[PDB]
């Protein structure tokens, strides 16, 4: 329940519940991209990816 | 392995332009490196990094972003300001410290446009701006630094803010009150005083005694000075009052920067 | 919704409809197998008869 | 029946500038024809023809094009070049002459991107540029010609060079020696002389034998004099030695033109 | 979240006065910051950290706590000395780098008293006192720093202490001898020579070769160089020797700081 | 507990001669302190760490040591040059910080000799040399640093370098070009472009931006900027080109230093 009070509270909140279990998922995907390090696969998988604006594409005809 | 590149030309770079650098999609931006001549950082004014149109960090000028970086002591060249998207200050609790600090990078993955739109002075003497960017492995947006304006009057006396934005599941990483005759300043949660009433002397040696460079007409409220994330303020949707009690010497306007952190969301904060 | 200079279309035709293939081939094989039923139910109606 | 369409306007043409063409992908180009002014052809430098973010052909300057096509005796306007993806040069030894010169077509099908990036020198009075595409039925990118370069110093007496990219299952098409001093050249593999000590005066006769022009400070050695894809060089995966012995009378760093061929692979040369 | 505090006032604040620093028992105490001033570190004598009336660590004069942050580099201000009991040179082996920093903090749970006793010098100007606490949430005092003050006499030769104190279960991080006359030092335990007779000169290369400052006449040897707390030296039950010899210049009387470490107990050393 | 030793004394210590280092087979050596007087660094020849009589590092004179420690700030004192082979800059993804620091010492089990050779210049004044090793719990060699030296010509231009070793299962943790006319550097891997052509003072800025101390004459392409090991270079033997394009204003012959890493192998690189 909460409460206001000035004065340095003796007993405070520390629980960081769902901030943590996201913050594993974040430690969880570094080990991800660790693991693609560690090999030679994953610095050529990388290597296909370009940072580009997008597509457009337009056709007709009978073939 | 991460790639180091040149990103394209800056588009229409001249005095009184409104220019942006568009960043490609795709990839991770871990530290974006801007040249700037023939122009004060404090000449490119309206800094605003966007994701998918939406604002995510803001910057009065570009001098704001120098003093940011100042503050964490990292490495300050005339010429050159970076923006720090990964942590170089993160420290692990329950991961690797590199974990923590890449956890803050810029993925792409997933966007439409990621932009850093800016206004260059009219009085800029032959504006001449370049980036480079160093990236690493695609990754959602996710966890990102927010930096928010604030515009709040102070008096000679004490001022009381408690209607700063409290966006429920993210974090206030530190609180900047940017004024010239602040004394002390006190926070507090939900009546629980958090920090007592800190004469800025105080204040600005426990910043110092954790590797930070005091700026000037600033006072500084770090919630990570240890770089433990989990010492934040985590904005609990069950949080009834977030107040700030300052005392000043002077009557003045101060700008209230807001560290926020969060999980970005295309309809969030 | 942003404004950009960035864009995925795709403009193409289209084609719509498709009688008389479909029906033909199936039309030809049902008819069959009914046909196979009526010989079966013709067998065992004719046997009833062979048990009177 | 082929398309003639008024490519979309090019963004950004400026000076200084770094801009792209940005092919639409779903159908098949035979020639691009960029229309240029206010700019010279050596202006527009660093011009790459990328497939999916992967280089496929470069151009130190856009006059190198203007130069291939000279080559060629293909017509030539001022304040235009084109980029003749379909070789109108070849024969059929197997096939008809046009399913010969129709196969080097820039075929998009199963692509996500087909650039044509390139940067506008700072010196540009006033850069004008815009694009037509002649287009035919989509295609998968398939056999392709990639332009590439290298640079190596070329001495006064005798210059080898042997450390040519040798992409498997790829061929050579020509190479051009671009140096100033260069008096005869020699050609093997394996220790076999494909082309003896020839004289320039010698090999640039046999070029224009066969309706090439000579280019200035260029020793050409053209695979495919006949326009018959199977005379170019087959880099076999055995080949154990691909080795060009340059008599100079100079000494300068000379830039060597390798037209590459082979089936567009997006993991491949 | 931690909570910076404004200590209560220090009572009977005057020279020639004894006073005390009480600490309300509840939380954790990461760091103390004691500001001064009419009063030199060295007249506030005797400094005493006391637990439940036992003693935790002793300075001869709040001089010796200036150098003890001063050879670890840590932030030193000019009218301010912190109490550093959180270990931020500390490094995680199997643990985080916070986990092993933290786990030196002053937690107060089960305690009856927690107290920081000094004596003010008669010769003080205008002794002014004030403290604020860095604290966090409560833990038992558990494994806490333990310095232990030592004077031994040092004659011009070679002097050996083997009566050091051997607490069983306890570690020694450092050791510090204060003398103006020592040349080297040689530390060995049961006849194994941990340290070989090391020159002033080589041990201080090492000790700044990991970040540490060497203090003025002072032989320190420190065994937790790398910031691993399992560096240390492990007071074993069966250790039946363990040596120091000092090779000196001066005949003179040596103050030995031990640094020990433990699980603080009520009824142990 | 680490073990501080002073080494055994150096054997013929004299001008014009080649002397040796011999260590002791048994334990893990972190550091190794070389104290020197009356010759110069560079008066030091033709260094070399031997395993097993087969070489690991290779330094053409004491001054590349210094220089090496010198890049990554470490503790730099005159008369006295250290032998880092615990990596005090790496930091741990999946495992702790000290581990990866740690894990690059000097283990010494399972070898017959481990020497660290050198030749003193006929020109030393009265040289003077002594060492001191921080060792720790004996270790096979395992993951090791290993310094290589090639020389290669530059042009004033562009000059490529594509024939660096690539030892199959090894990395690159960094890349020194010393030359005094680079202006800009290119890394690829395949075609793929990893290193953008980046200019000298920008690629200086990133380096520094690291805590990195930019070295004189020289171009550095740290690989390992976060202290990350994996995010070094993985010489995978399916690559088929690992080239460097470097941009110079000077024709000279450049000194290209390249750190190797690997598990150290009696039939290794
Ligand atoms: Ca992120
Ligand atoms: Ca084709
Ligand atoms: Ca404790
Ligand atoms: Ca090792």
Not at chain 1, 28 to 46: C, D, L, N
Not at chain 2, 119 to 142: C, F, M, N, R
Not at chain 2, 223 to 243: A, H, N
Request: aromatic share 6%; net charge neutral.
């Amino acid at each position: 329940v909460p409460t206001s009070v000035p004065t340095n509270q003796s007993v405070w909140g520390n629980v960081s519940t769902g901030l943590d279990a996201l913050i594993s998922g974040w430690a969880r995907v570094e080990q991800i991209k660790a693991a693609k390090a560690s090999t030679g696969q994953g610095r050529v998988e990388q290597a296909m990816t370009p940072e580009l604006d997008n597509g457009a594409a337009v056709v007709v005809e009978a073939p | 392995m991460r790639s180091f590149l040149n990103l394209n030309s800056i588009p229409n770079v001249a005095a009184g332009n409104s220019c942006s650098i568009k960043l490609p999609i795709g990839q991770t931006y871990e530290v974006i490196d801007l040249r700037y001549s023939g122009v004060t950082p404090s000449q490119i004014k309206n800094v605003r990094v966007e994701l998918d149109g939406r604002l995510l960090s803001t910057y009065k000028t570009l001098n704001d972003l120098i003093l940011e970086n100042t503050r964490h002591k990292r490495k300050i060249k005339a010429g050159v300001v970076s923006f720090h998207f990964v942590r170089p200050e993160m420290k692990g609790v329950n991961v690797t410290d590199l974990v923590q600090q890449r956890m803050f990078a810029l993925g792409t993955v997933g966007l439409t446009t990621c932009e850093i739109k800016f206004d260059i002075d009219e009085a800029a003497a032959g504006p001449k701006l370049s980036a480079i960017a160093q990236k690493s492995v695609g990754t959602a947006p996710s966890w990102l630094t927010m930096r928010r304006n604030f515009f709040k009057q102070l008096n000679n006396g004490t001022t009381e803010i408690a209607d700063l934005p409290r966006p429920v599941g993210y974090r206030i990483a530190a609180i900047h009150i940017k004024a010239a005759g602040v004394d002390a300043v006190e926070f507090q949660i939900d009546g629980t005083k958090w920090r007592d009433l800190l004469k800025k002397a105080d204040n600005d040696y426990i910043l110092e005694q954790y590797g930070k460079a005091v700026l000037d007409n600033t006072y500084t409220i770090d919630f990570m000075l240890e770089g433990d994330v989990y010492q934040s303020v985590l904005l609990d949707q069950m949080i009834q009052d977030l107040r700030l009690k300052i005392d000043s010497t002077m009557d003045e306007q101060a700008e209230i920067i807001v560290e926020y952190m969060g999980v970005w969301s295309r309809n969030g904060f | 919704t942003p404004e950009l200079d960035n864009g995925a279309a795709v403009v193409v035709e289209a084609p719509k409809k498709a009688a008389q293939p479909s029906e033909t081939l199936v039309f030809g094989v049902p008819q069959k197998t009914l046909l196979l039923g009526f010989g079966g139910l013709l067998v065992l109606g004719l046997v009833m008869r062979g048990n009177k």
